[PDB]
From Swiss-Prot:
Any GO MF annotation of the entry: protein domain specific binding
PROSITE patterns attached to this UniProt entry: CHEW
Entry keyword Flavoprotein: no
Record localization: Cytoplasm
Lineage: superkingdom: Bacteria
CDD domains to which the protein is assigned, alphabetical: CheW (cd00732)
Gene designation: cheW
One annotated GO biological process: signal transduction
Entry protein name: Chemotaxis protein CheW
Organism of this sequence: Thermotoga maritima (strain ATCC 43589 / DSM 3109 / JCM 10099 / NBRC 100826 / MSB8)
Gene Ontology cellular component list: cytosol
Length: 151
């Protein structure tokens, strides 16, 4: 651990492909990517949560942030799944092909995180090396995961 902390130009993150455009989640919260499909089909009940799974005496809910957010995504090339711990919530997001480690630059954060690049349902839009990508620290997306109920 650096501890001293300094500079905030580049940043490591979790990333996957999303209908031609790239997408990344603050690898800090993101635990690891898991390969699976058609999770918890009969136990349906809600709507957002596509599935769930029991493990280590704790069930985790898998949803599609790309759905909560929107993006080009539309369950077209979806295949891989992602896990993320959030305020005692082991959340999950299914994607197409997750590249994993990503060299995302984050000019957003500096004083205490601030950017409306795509703060419609997350932190915001990301861009690097003349390439388009979506980025989020699962903060607003998770917040909605819990308070989803409302209509």
């Amino acid at each position: 651990m650096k501890t001293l902390a300094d500079a905030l130009k580049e940043f490591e993150v979790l990333s996957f492909e999303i209908d031609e455009q790239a997408l990344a989640f603050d690898v800090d919260n993101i635990e690891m990517v898991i390969e699976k499909s058609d999770i918890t089909p009969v136990p349906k009940s809600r709507h957002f949560v596509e599935g769930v799974i029991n493990l280590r005496g704790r069930i985790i809910p898998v949803v599609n942030l790309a759905k909560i957010l929107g993006i080009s995504f539309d369950e077209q090339k979806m295949k891989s799944i992602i896990v993320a711990r959030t305020k005692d919530v082991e959340v999950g997001f299914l994607v197409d092909r997750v590249l994993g480690v990503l060299r995302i630059t984050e000019n957003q954060l500096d004083l205490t995180n601030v950017s409306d690049k795509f703060g419609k349902k997350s932190k915001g839009l990301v861009k690097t090396d003349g390439r388009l990508i979506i980025y989020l620290d699962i903060d607003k997306i998770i917040e909605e995961i819990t308070v989803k109920e409302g209509v």
